[PDB]
């Protein structure tokens, strides 16, 4: 029941429920000639709304902030951005531009700038050693070292037992590396051990692209990763 590729036409985003209190949103985008999907984390936060990440780039973001208004009807006061690509960043002007307040570590703050993306308004503090967590409204941030990126968060739900790894994690139909232009191969896999060993009770896995699943996605992605160094 989880919305594929094929379902969704670019510029147009679709809701999950996952818990109660707690969604995916789901995009598409084309890219030289293929169409990708990308996830995103929306979390209610007594009445108000934590979005994580954009719906990559402005016209998908602006679909995202009116389908949460039509389905869920809570107002989006804060987002952050787990890296600095686009898909992750691209729409935080249209978010600033509604009200959103935009948060991302310094790091990632560093290299979008370098990039030329958008650049989330806040600095995360407490972010900047491998392992670090903070708390954030009803999620906690954690940095588990590079990985897909050097600056790259992963976010869990108490509430409801959801990690979202973000790009840092592959969905299991991806057996091949995807864009690990800016990745840390070396890191990558002991940067999943952490995430493993801080939340072993993760009941409900979010890649950055693709299907959920259980917490077997963090070991698949070390193996398409340990694979692709060895290529
Ligand atoms: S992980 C950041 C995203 S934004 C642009 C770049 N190219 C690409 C192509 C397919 C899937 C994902 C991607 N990435
Ligand atoms: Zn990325
Ligand atoms: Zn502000
Ligand atoms: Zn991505």
Redesign the pocket.
Known sequence: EYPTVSEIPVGEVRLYQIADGVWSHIATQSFDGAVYPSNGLIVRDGDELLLIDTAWGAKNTAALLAEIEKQIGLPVTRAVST???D??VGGVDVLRAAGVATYASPSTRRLAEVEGNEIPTHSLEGLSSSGDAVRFGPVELFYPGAA??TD?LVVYVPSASVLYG??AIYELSRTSAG?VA?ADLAEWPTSIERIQQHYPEAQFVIP?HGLPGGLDLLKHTTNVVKAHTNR
């Open positions: 890296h600095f690509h898909d992750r897909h990126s790259n973000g790009c864009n800016d950055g």
